[PDB]
């Protein structure tokens, strides 16, 4: 796990990762073209970093995404394979960051940075329970 | 559209918008805290901008998210109302730029910037359909 080290994650886009499936509650997204939603792209980018940093975790710890800063530069219909490359940028204590990039076999589809913080799973949950209605 | 206008968009987070629901095919996300996913927050910020932009589009037009750059600073359980405030920064031809911010009624949860591009829906669908395998 060294600064500049690369991790790669591949994913064939299925029909149910398009805009309309991100928010089936949204009339505005219902009649939208059948392309990979930016929110699922983000999720897939975060998922590549979660897998890259798994060696760093102590038992009882997990992680939260704390920033995402990316472009989304071409569209992807179902059937193409999206490859995410996550390049470790910094590791300082609980704080990690990556440069992320994604390509669907035809175009580069976007790139930027993602930041994560290591959490104590049980402390964090009690914290969320406290703000639960 | 007028620069500096604020639009707000309220959403009661349901059980199906937590992390594990974003990628049910990810074993990593399966074990995450039951909290609103960053990818779902990105889609919510987009929805708010789409609603704001709607009455200034011509018939046949929609839009795409081209960039997002935001923090995610506090976590949100199902049952809270997430309010996105989106403020128009600029309009230049097909490009609209936005300052966005989100709060769950308890904490500020994130803020930063979003960019969109106006598209002709039929033309874009046709072109995307032609990179489909």
* Backbone φ, ψ for residue B46 (5° rounding): -60, -50
Chain-centre distance of CA B30, in angstroms?
23
Q: Could you list the residue range(s) of the whole structural domain that residue B30 is in?
A: 1-133
Residue A12 forms contact with B (CB below 8 Å): no
Q: How would you classify residue A119: left for phi > 0, otherwise alpha for psi between -120 and 50, otherwise beta?
A: beta
Which residues in chain A have their CB less than 8 angstroms from residue B112's CB?
69
Contacts of B27 (CB under 8 A, 6+ apart): none
- How many angstroms is the resolution? 1.9
B55, with CB counted inside 10 A (0-12, 13-18, 19+), is exposed
Measured distance CA(B52)–CA(A60) in Å, rounded: 43
Closest CA to A58 of A101, A97, A93: A93
Cβ distance B64 to A19 under 8 Å? no
Closest residue on chain B to A121 (Cα): B33
> What CATH number is attached to the domain comprising A67?
3.10.129.10
Contacts of B77 (CB under 8 A, 6+ apart): A128, A129, A131, A132, A133, B13, B34, B35, B36
Which residues in chain A have their CB less than 8 angstroms from residue B68's CB?
38, 42, 68-70, 72
**Which of A11, A29, A39, A82 is the best substitution to test chain B (most B C-beta atoms within 10 A)?**
A39
Residue B58 forms contact with A (CB below 8 Å): no
Measured distance CA(B51)–CA(B4) in Å, rounded: 16
The total number of structural domains that make up chain B: 1
* Window 80-99 of A, Cβ < 8 Å to B: 80
Residue B117 forms contact with A (CB below 8 Å): no
Residue B2 forms contact with A (CB below 8 Å): no
Residues in chain B: 133
Chain-centre distance of CA A102, in angstroms?
11
Inspect the interface and report whether the beta carbons of A33 and B66 lie closer than 8 Å.
no
């Amino acid at each position: 796990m060294r600064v500049g080290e690369r991790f790669t994650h591949d994913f064939v886009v299925p029909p149910h990762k398009t805009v309309r499936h991100l928010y089936p509650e949204s009339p505005e997204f219902a009649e939208f073209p059948e392309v990979f939603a930016s929110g699922f792209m983000v999720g897939l980018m975060e998922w590549a970093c979660v897998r890259a940093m798994a060696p760093y975790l102590e038992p009882g710890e997990g992680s939260l995404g704390t920033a995402i800063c990316v472009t989304h530069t071409a569209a992807t219909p179902p059937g193409l394979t999206v490859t995410v490359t996550a390049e470790l940028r910094s590791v300082e204590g609980r704080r990690l960051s990556w440069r992320v990039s994604a390509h669907d076999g035809v175009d580069e589809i976007g790139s930027g940075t993602h930041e994560r913080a290591v959490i104590h799973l049980e402390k964090f949950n009690a914290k969320v329970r406290q703000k639960t209605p």
